[PDB]
């Protein structure tokens, strides 16, 4: 929850032991009280300008949550926070050395370093590992 | 002022291929299933309400988060007179889901209540030792 946005990547993994600062917990403690049924204690009393906007607000709260669970769901990394993969890093993506990425770098600058290359990494996890391991697992159950 | 050919795969690109060639392709049909004057909003809920159902049925079967998985439910040869290597090397999926369309309801009941319901009462009572 953005408390370490000026910290470094080699140090922000220390405070990330809290559940991304209880990231998703702020949603459930919100939608317990977003679903205060005073909206149902009125039926909004009409259709109003705000309730049009709240309806377009809750949808984005639904969709953009799902696009982050699905991508974690497909990567063999459902529900975890720090998982490793089988994909080898290609040095053509970034010729930065080891410590400069971790000890000597922010996060948002590192986004603009590989925002070009990000989409290639997405395919190169699924079709390289999570499509792939499931067949090789199923072969190991053939016996 | 752009343009290069295909690299990995396309959307629905394996839908004329065999099963053994489409089984390595499932992620592209898995990603774009969700993302893509009120009548846009009525679409933006049906696209959600279809996604949860397919997500939910994988959840009940002990098979959530995996793309593929196996069970212990036995295949019944009454359902298919097709030989084995004809299925994995000759038949496409679009043809295949016209052939087992009728049996589908029998299948889904015979996954949950057959096994993954039964693999919890057996599972919970492997304690006490």
């Amino acid at each position: 929850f953005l408390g370490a946005a000026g910290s470094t990547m080699g140090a922000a993994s220390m405070t990330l032991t809290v559940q991304a600062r209880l990231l998703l917990s702020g949603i459930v403690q919100q939608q317990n009280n977003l679903l205060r049924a005073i909206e149902a204690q009125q039926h909004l009393l009409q259709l109003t300008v705000w309730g049009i906007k709240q309806l377009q607000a809750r949808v984005l709260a639904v969709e953009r949550y799902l696009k982050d669970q699905q991508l974690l769901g497909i990567w063999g990394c459902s529900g975890k926070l720090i998982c490793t993969t089988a994909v080898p890093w290609n040095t053509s993506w970034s010729n930065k050395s080891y410590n400069q990425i971790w000890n000597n770098m922010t996060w948002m600058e590192w986004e603009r370093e590989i925002d070009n290359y990000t989409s290639l990494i997405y395919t190169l996890i699924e079709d390289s590992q999570n499509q792939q391991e499931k067949n090789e697992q199923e072969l190991l159950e053939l016996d | 002022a752009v343009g290069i050919g295909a690299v990995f795969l396309g959307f629905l690109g394996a839908a004329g291929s065999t099963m053994g060639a489409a089984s390595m392709t499932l992620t592209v049909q898995a990603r774009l299933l969700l993302s893509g004057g009120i009548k846009q909003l009525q679409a933006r809920v049906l696209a959600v309400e279809r996604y949860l159902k397919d997500q939910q049925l994988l959840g009940i079967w002990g098979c959530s988060g995996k793309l593929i998985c196996t069970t212990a439910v036995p295949w019944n040869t009454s359902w298919s007179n097709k030989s084995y290597n004809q299925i994995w090397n000759n038949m496409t999926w679009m043809e295949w889901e016209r052939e087992i369309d009728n049996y589908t309801s029998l299948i889904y009941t015979l996954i949950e209540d057959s096994q993954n319901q039964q693999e919890k009462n057996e599972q919970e009572l492997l304690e006490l030792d």
Epitope: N116, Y117, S119, L120, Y122, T123 | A1, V2, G3, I4, G5, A6, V7, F8, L9, G10, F11, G13, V28, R31, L32
Partner: antibody, heavy 134, light 109 residues
Framework: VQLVESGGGVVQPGKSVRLSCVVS????????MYWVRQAPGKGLEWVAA????????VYSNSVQGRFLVSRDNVKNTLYLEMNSLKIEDTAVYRC????????????????????????????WGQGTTVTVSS | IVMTQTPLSLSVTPGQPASISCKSS???????????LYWYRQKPGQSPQLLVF???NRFSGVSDRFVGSGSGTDFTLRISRVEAEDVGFYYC?????????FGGGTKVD
Amino acid sequence: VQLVESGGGVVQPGKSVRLSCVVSDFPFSKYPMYWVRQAPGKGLEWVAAISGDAWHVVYSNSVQGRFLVSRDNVKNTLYLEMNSLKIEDTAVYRCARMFQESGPPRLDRWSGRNYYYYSGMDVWGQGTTVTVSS
Amino acid sequence: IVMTQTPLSLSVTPGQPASISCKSSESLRQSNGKTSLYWYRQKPGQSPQLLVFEVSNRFSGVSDRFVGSGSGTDFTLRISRVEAEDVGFYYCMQSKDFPLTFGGGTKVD
């Protein structure tokens, strides 16, 4: 920066030479290049183009299949090899850099196909000249 | 695609404004949000130099009196108070797709 060529001159029909454009200071693997052909007393004709990673090559239709281009990002060179020469190929060749920077290839999600962006030119080399005659 | 221009010869003297337009067959608007038409100038006996890259922006070492505009098909480069060293040619160059062509080059004396 500095941008010239080499290997120019005059040859016969049916022959084959290769020029050599050399850049000076900018990071050469970052940028794509081009080739242009100004005929004497005429306008300009586009010839060729290479990607920054030397993977994408687009030729003109008239000189299709005959010529050859390549890169060497370490040696910062730029080659235009040519084959099956004709007399109407006698003109001024110029080595030229893209104006903007280019990125890496894009890979649209919906179809597994990359995309190399291509935009026009700012730095024309003064260029050699090849004449095809008897 | 095809893209020619007009007029070929404008033999003038300094002190007056004028304009050179390049006419487009295929309309130009790429999906990035911009129209890839590049206007630039050679001198006689010289490799050319960039006047303006886009029809909006300019380049370094360019006088302020060099203005350009146009629709997706109409395209116009206007030179206010045409300067004494405006000799040579003026090529209109597009960058839609391949093969990317040119104009003939309007001679200005």
